[PDB]
Design a protein around this ligand. Sequence first.
Ligand code: HEM
Ligand code: HEM
Ligand code: HEM
Ligand code: HEM
Lengths: 283, 283, 283, 284
Amino acid sequence: FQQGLLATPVPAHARHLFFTLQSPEALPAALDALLPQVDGKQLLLGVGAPLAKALGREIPGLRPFPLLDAAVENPSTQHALWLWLRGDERGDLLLRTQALEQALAPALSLADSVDGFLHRGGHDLTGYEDGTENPTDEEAVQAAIAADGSSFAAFQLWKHDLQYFKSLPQADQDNIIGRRLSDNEELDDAPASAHVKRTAQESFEPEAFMVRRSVSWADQRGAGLAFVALGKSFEAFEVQLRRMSGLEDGIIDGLYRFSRPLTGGYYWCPPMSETGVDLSPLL
Amino acid sequence: FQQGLLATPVPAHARHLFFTLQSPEALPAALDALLPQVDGKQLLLGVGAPLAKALGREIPGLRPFPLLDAAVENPSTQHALWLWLRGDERGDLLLRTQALEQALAPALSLADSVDGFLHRGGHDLTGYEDGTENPTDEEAVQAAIAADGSSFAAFQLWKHDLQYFKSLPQADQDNIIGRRLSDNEELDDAPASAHVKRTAQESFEPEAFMVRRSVSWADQRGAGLAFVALGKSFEAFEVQLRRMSGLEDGIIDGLYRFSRPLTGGYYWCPPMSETGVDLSPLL
Amino acid sequence: FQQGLLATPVPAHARHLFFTLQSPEALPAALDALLPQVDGKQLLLGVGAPLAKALGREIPGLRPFPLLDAAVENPSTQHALWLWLRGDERGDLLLRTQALEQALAPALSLADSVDGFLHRGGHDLTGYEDGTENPTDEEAVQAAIAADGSSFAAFQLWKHDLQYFKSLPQADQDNIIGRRLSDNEELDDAPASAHVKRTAQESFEPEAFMVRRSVSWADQRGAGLAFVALGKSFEAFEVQLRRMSGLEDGIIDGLYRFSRPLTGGYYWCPPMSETGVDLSPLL
Amino acid sequence: FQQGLLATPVPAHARHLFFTLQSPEALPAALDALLPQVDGKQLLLGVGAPLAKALGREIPGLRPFPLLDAAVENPSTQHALWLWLRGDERGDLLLRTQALEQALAPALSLADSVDGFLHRGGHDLTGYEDGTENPTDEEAVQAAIAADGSSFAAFQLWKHDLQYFKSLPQADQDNIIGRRLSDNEELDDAPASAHVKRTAQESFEPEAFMVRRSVSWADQRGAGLAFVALGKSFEAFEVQLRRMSGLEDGIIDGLYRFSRPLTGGYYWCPPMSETGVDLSPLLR
Ligand code: HEM
Ligand code: HEM
Ligand code: HEM
Ligand code: HEM
């Protein structure tokens, strides 16, 4: 039906690969080696708008990452293919990507990769628990999985300024997130710019529910959160990001005081059949 | 009334700085230290759409880097401020950026920087001369400078695959560029995908003339061309990139066979007064 | 009373920090904040030869990493202080280093750091199990712990060429290691250049036994093995490396066909008292 | 009969390459393509001790970068081969290195590279002029060129903390260098830890003269000085570094307050013959 992008216990490590279609004529050999490996559990697949446009196919609901003319920076770095590796072994995830690069040889070239890890049981490097208000069980299926079993994922690589965020008094940190670090209690007196106040899923006229599967990351670029939002469409994520960016009321999310996204991508996660991944509407 | 963006001898070195508005309340102290240094000759200034939106001001013609839903990737990495340092001394430009970072420290944080150099007298790292068909003297002023003396610049950091491009036969390299490497003579029988055929300035519905001030670059990200396009508006550059991306006729520029842009930005270069740079429209 | 550097189950992640003594006048304040944190289990401490020289103290058995005039490269990158972080949470080790850098900010500066992880249950990224012939229980204490509670540690960051090593036939890989990858069986007819043949602990005039606590690593520098050898002295490690380098018989270890060390350091791990780590001899 | 290691006008840019001998069996094919390109002016060659050790040859005066048991850190990062590219075009030097990697492909692999540039006319990024007391003309030949026309070069990649050093008062900066930044006047009352006082070439019982051809550098590792010291032997440089490290009198050079070396290498620059560079002592 769907890919296992909602599996309850999240593995300790993840690796997100992003490929650019450098040689579209050599695409058939790449798909012959990739598709038998896409089980939706240890290796998940996402199709970008450039890949659909290059093959002359239109995927309903698929479009590139939007362009927000706001006072904050939300870059659009749309790629052709997104590979999401999951597993408890960090080195195993590293060796699979090296094999995936060779198997995808001339058609697709690696444009970006993220060595992600689950901090604690699902906490940001700032210490705050993330995933408290994520839909669970069937309501996660209703909010993240479309009718045909497919999902629409948005990815953003947020870079944290941990030194500055920890320089603030604890009351300033809690007012930025909207939750108390000591006990994860929601602050009902937080300013409207608080992240929890900006992204309250029930505070939108169409309820902007979504399933978030974010993990932490750290390399030469710094450290932060690899944000992943899964939805039955992109409308949930996009209406949240527009309000965080101040495009609705003029109030900008407090996250931008210490963190900014480095990348931005929209990807269509194809449905699963009983005999593997179903990429038919494209293939 | 314009910044010296057309100076006849291009200095041997350039340095392009891109800043993110991290703390908008501390902007006045940043502007007090920055504006006395903007002479338009050794330090040029460009205003991004995020900076205009944060101050609640609308500059006619200023908008973020566009989002092209094409089969090739032209990322949109719009920042708030662009500082363009020019000079013959590479170390002098480096020490000036360190002073500029410290002086703009809390309001603006450095998001990206490019150590550019003029290869030979104005050649791309592939060996082809770039700037052959650039307008000069008064025709350059009409194509790059608006009525109020301001200019609208588009920036792209292209990453070259020099090993692959030099692996091609010399006839294939000339057909990708559209010009003969041996004598810079235009190949009149090159395919429609040739770069010169894609960007023929006289072949556009309104003549899409522009002044290009590109330089080479090389660091840990690789090597390529720091593309800078100056126009009286963004319509010249944008109609060129849309045709290069196959959005007009379906034919994609041959440059994408060996090079792809890593960044994309639109910036408004304010006019010059007799008493320094004129930012009044935005104060 | 030794530091817990021999605990049988190795945590999933490690972090090796290396500091240079930039400001000796601020050293006492740095030690006042650091030494209460050295428990020898989650945070272990190693003293380098430069630190002993700066305080005018001589530690018996402490000397810098040697200089091997061989046909292979074993660089000597001796630092003043070594901090060895252990834990199952990769992000916890990251946030600890940020706090350790700030607390040691003026006296000691971070010269190098390694984000290490235990691959599978203790395998190299090439797939071979490492630690098969490591002494255990009392034999580990006899080989790694001196008469006092102290130990002498050697550190090397080996960079692997996994693409080249995996390109070789499996029989060629096994002849380099000296063991069969399929079943970890020792090859009794492997060439003398095999690693196991070069480092056979029982083949030295005094038996050169040692406890190895190496982990894998991967960052912008590549990927490989963070080699850690603990001994009652440096004579065990040093006599192994000289034979691996061909300084004994002229035969060079097969490891240098696909791997090379990037760093090299000798560090004295002080004993533990009931009141924390015991730096008496150095005061 | 020597490589153009003393040419008076230094080109605006340099690129120092360092190679590791990964596959000795493909070394003859690598040397066949490299040696005809070494003219000693735009491309200079330096032989490391591992390369001589791999060929079973002993070069008199060639040894790895030394091991200094001092209170400061001078790492020894000895490589097999050193290629020193010089030229006024930064991009030309980049394209020649990519071709050199392919020409040296399986035998030698690039271990480290430095994109160097001549700051101002010969100034450090701190602003101080470097090369003031460098020997010139024939006295440079006497100090840097051996009898057989060969030279022994020492290389160090120093990383500067410009933010910290420039935060200090100018009197503190001048006391570290031993010279006044405002007019390059030598401070005759500077502390013994001053760099000029530590490295005073006439203050050694055998005069430790050497020709320095350093350039600035800046990349992801930071910024500083790519230090290159040329001598008729390594004894000049080595006795200077021992004093800077406090191994002679216990006084450490003030440079270590804001800068530290990241690499260290000894390289033998072979003489030039009528038919190019002369590696005979290595290739009979
Ligand atoms: C650096 C980036 C981010 C960080 C550190 C972060 C952190 C957090 C934390 C700690 C919570 C509270 C725990 C929870 O309910 O999950 C939260 C909630 C939430 N966040 Fe984020 N977040 C980030 C980015 C985003 C983005 C880009 C979006 C949407 C475009 C988003 C949407 C949400 C939503 C919908 C909730 C649940 C709010 C509710 O219904 O109570 N987050 N986030
Ligand atoms: C890797 C990136 C690029 C390279 C290597 C490159 C190189 C060149 C070269 C060698 C020429 C021929 C010499 C000349 O007439 O100037 C040329 C022409 C030109 N290019 Fe580019 N260019 C690049 C990107 C771009 C982009 C992104 C645009 C526009 C969006 C552009 C617009 C033009 C124009 C307008 C001309 C002049 C065509 C004419 O009127 O004859 N270039 N370029
Ligand atoms: C890239 C670097 C290295 C790798 C990948 C590596 C890997 C291995 C492997 C696979 C084994 C066989 C399994 C075992 O008995 O533990 C082994 C054994 C051993 N290694 Fe290493 N090793 C490396 C470096 C070194 C160095 C530099 C030394 C000493 C200077 C060393 C000392 C030993 C010893 C003493 C043994 C046990 C040999 C025996 O008694 O059978 N290793 N290593
Ligand atoms: C960060 C590293 C270094 C910097 C910034 C630096 C800079 C300078 C400066 C500004 C001078 C004075 C001007 C001149 O006479 O050229 C100087 C002199 C000198 N330096 Fe350095 N230098 C560095 C490293 C070294 C090292 C490592 C050595 C030797 C091991 C050395 C050897 C010398 C000598 C011999 C002199 C001439 C002293 C005299 O006779 O007056 N330098 N250097």
